[PDB]
Amino acid sequence: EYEIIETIGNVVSSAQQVAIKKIPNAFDVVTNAKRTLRELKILKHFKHDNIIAIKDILRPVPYGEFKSVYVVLDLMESDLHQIIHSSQPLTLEHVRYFLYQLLRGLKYMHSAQVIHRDLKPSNLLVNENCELKIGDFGMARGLCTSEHQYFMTEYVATRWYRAPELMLSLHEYTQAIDLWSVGCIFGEMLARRQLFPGKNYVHQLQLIMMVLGTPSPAVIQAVGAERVRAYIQSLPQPVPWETVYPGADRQALSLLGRMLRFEPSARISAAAALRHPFLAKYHDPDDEPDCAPPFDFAFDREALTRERIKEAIVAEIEDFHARREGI
Numbered sequence: 315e316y317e318i319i320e321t322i323g324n325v326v327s328s329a330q331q332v333a334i335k336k337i338p339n340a341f342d343v344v345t346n347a348k349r350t351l352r353e354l355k356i357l358k359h360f361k362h363d364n365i366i367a368i369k370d371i372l373r374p375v376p377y378g379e380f381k382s383v384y385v386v387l388d389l390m391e392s393d394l395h396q397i398i399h400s401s402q403p404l405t406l407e408h409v410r411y412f413l414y415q416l417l418r419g420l421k422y423m424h425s426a427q428v429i430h431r432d433l434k435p436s437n438l439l440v441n442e443n444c445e446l447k448i449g450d451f452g453m454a455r456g457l458c459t460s461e462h463q464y465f466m467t468e469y470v471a472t473r474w475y476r477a478p479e480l481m482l483s484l485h486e487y488t489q490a491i492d493l494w495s496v497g498c499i500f501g502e503m504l505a506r507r508q509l510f511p512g513k514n515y516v517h518q519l520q521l522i523m524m525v526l527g528t529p530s531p532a533v534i535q536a537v538g539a540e541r542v543r544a545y546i547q548s549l550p551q552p553v554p555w556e557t558v559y560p561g562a563d564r565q566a567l568s569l570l571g572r573m574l575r576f577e578p579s580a581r582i583s584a585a586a587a588l589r590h591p592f593l594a595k596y597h598d599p600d601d602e603p604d605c606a607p608p609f610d611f612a613f614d615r616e617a618l619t620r621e622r623i624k625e626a627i628v629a630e631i632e633d634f635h636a637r638r639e640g641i
């Protein structure tokens with residue numbers, strides 16, 4: 315059926331060209347197997363041009379020897395990290411178009427009660443024809459949660475893009491998490507360099523404070539871990555986005571400012587971001603769908619043995635083929 319050529323990320327390999335992902339020893343570790351089942355069900359639930367899609371899943375040898383899962387996707391030229399940090403063009407109009415598509419993908423995603431929680435340029439794929447697709451859904455969760463990650467929210471996802479609520483454990487974990495990350499991504503496109511490149515937990519809070527200023531007392535009281543509160547209080551106003559990005563566009567910084575706020579409830583939504591004057595060029599409500607029905611994460615909260623999860627994953631592969639080949 316397919317012929318491999320070269321390995322890309324590490325396992326994904328190039329191979330009509332396609333990308334093929336090996337998930338080796340998929341059923342050997344509970345965490346890895348649970349993540350594979352979550353990704354399967356999320357990607358099958360979504361049908362949207364700005365969200366990665368599975369083209370094919372290679373079938374099962376006898377069942378007991380079924381160890382690895384191969385997943386076929388359409389090959390994407392690059393990702394937004396490789397584009398941002400290179401000699402490629404990235405004018406304001408590039409920034410405007412890439413931001414639109416991310417936000418278009420998020421409106422759909424957020425309407426199904428799914429929070430990505432791991433948006434960074436490297437997870438935003440871009441093909442030869444400039445379609446941007448959100449990938450890598452292993453960190454995604456709903457509004458309700460059961461996991462070590464219930465506590466320890468400061469270890470959720472990637473440090474340079476992590477929202478203050480996770481860092482500080484503010485007990486208000488919503489789709490607003492992704493809009494922080496978008497803010498960082500947006501800022502990073504405008505300057506071609508990371509906005510908040512923290513070295514460790516403490517330096518990451520510094521660098522956010524050096525732009526956003528001191529957080530409010532009501533935010534500080536909602537920090538549960540007392541040791542972090544003491545550090546914040548030991549330090550002696552916001553820096554205007556104009557002086558952070560000197561040559562930048564006016565409409566862009568307005569929108570950026572509505573994303574990078576300490577308080578989750580103060581952040582603009584994906585839907586409302588798409589109504590901002592900066593994205594008027596591309597904004598069409600009739601072409602920017604919601605996702606119905608919503609995604610249920612109940613299956614993830616179940617404490618399953620590796621073998622039950624294996625059975626679950628194999629049923630999602632069977633159902634994938636039945637919905638197209640059979641029916």
Ligand SMILES: COc1cc2ncnc(C3CCN(C(=O)c4ccc(OC(F)(F)F)cc4)CC3)c2cc1OC
Binds near residue numbers: 322390392451
């Ligand atoms: C030249 O650059 C690249 C092109 C690329 N083209 C296409 N797809 C990729 C990767 C994107 C991220 N990704 C997933 O989101 C994903 C999808 C399905 C999965 O299976 C399961 F879990 F549902 F079972 C697991 C992971 C894996 C595929 C690509 C990755 C590239 O660089 C790293």
